[PDB]
Amino acid sequence: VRKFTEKHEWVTTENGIGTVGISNFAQEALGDVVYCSLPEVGTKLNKQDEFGALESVKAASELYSPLSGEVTEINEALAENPGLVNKSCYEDGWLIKMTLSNPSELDELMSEEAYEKYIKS
């Protein structure tokens, strides 16, 4: 169960924890990622709040929150291997993990098959 945002961010939930990353379409557009600006653990985010940024060799994009919640963990493997988000955007290349202050916000995100039509139409 993977939902998407209009800014090409995905989220998956398990045990009340949302794992946030960027889609495969976005990382392909961005290229080889070099630096990931991630928020400190404990940051309280609102939906669509700008919580970070990604810098690639030939591109840069901002990261916007798909949910309202509190940041619980950041992917520490991105400091030594930032290329994980390019070739593991849905698994090892995740960015942050957060709580869900308002789980009903998941209905505002599009499904995985609605997002493929979103980028192809």
Partner: protein, 299 residues
């Protein structure tokens, strides 16, 4: 210090958006159906969103890359794939290219290609054929060709300059001092200059054009000497843009040139006598080439 020791952070004036929209997917669908490639995609150009699309309500264009997506050369700045034995030429690509441009309705079209040093004529006939199919379907259409150097083969250059094109483009890329560090060693400044000079003598009515990348370690004295040598070779148009690292395994940016400094280099091009000088950080050889041509050469 600034590269090969550290990394320079991307300045804000180089950030672009993820390509998106209906025009962008229309162009993509056409290219995949016809088995065509673009330099925009393979060189990972940051302007794809702007050139290919818009808001869905604009004039979409893209620079088709002929002769496959795999080059025989390994330029240290170029993210186009490299292989010693590229696949053979698709003879229908010159014909399918004219179909894609007829579909897009372009009045101005830019064509380019990978280098095919494995080909006896460097693929010049394959390029010239695409131009002929375009002019056959639309004689008034304006076509610009960003061609390889053909390793200085004068017969290969002639074949392209006789195809009927309007603009003959070939990029010098960098200053003469950095040719061996930046380009594939099969290219050099004197050879690139010989290409642009010869196309004029093959067809004196075509417009010659070349591009330079800044930020690879050159200094201003070398840049002005390069621009000065280009006017003495009778090159009409000039493009200057910021070099940007396309892949972590390609060259690091030595310096990020400010926007004001590109505006200065536009003035130098006007002082030297270029018919137009497209200058700016995100400017590339094909970037808004139609606008620059029509606003400056038909004016």
């Amino acid at each position: 210090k600034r590269q090969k020791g550290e990394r320079l952070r991307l300045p804000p004036w180089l950030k672009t958006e993820i390509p998106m929209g209906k025009n962008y997917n229309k162009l993509k669908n056409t290219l995949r159906n016809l088995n065509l490639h673009t330099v925009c995609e393979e060189a990972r150009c940051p302007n794809i969103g702007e050139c290919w699309g818009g808001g869905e309500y604009a004039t979409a264009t893209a620079t088709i890359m002929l002769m496959g997506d795999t080059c025989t050369r390994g330029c240290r700045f170029c993210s186009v794939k490299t292989a010693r034995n590229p696949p053979p030429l698709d003879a229908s690509e010159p014909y399918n290219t004219a179909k894609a441009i007829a579909e897009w309705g372009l009045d101005y079209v830019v064509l380019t290609s990978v280098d095919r040093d494995d080909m006896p004529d460097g693929g010049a006939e394959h390029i010239a054929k695409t131009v002929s199919y375009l002019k056959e379907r639309n004689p008034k259409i304006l076509v610009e060709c960003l061609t390889p150097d053909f390793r200085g083969d004068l017969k290969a250059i002639e074949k392209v300059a006789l195809s009927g094109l309007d603009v003959y483009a070939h990029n010098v890329e960098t200053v003469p001092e950095l040719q061996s560090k930046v380009r594939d060693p099969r290219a050099n400044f004197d050879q690139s200059l010989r290409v642009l000079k010869h196309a004029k003598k093959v067809q004196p009515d075509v417009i010659s054009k070349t591009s330079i990348m800044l930020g690879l370690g050159e200094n201003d004295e070398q840049v002005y000497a390069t621009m000065k040598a280009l006017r003495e070779a009778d090159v009409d148009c000039l493009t200057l843009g910021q070099y940007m690292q396309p892949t972590r395994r390609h060259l690091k940016v030595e310096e990020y040139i400010t926007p004001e400094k590109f505006k200065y280099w536009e003035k130098v091009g006007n002082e030297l006598g270029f018919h137009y000088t497209a200058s700016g950080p995100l400017v590339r050889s094909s970037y808004k080439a139609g606008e620059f041509f029509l606003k400056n050469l038909v004016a």
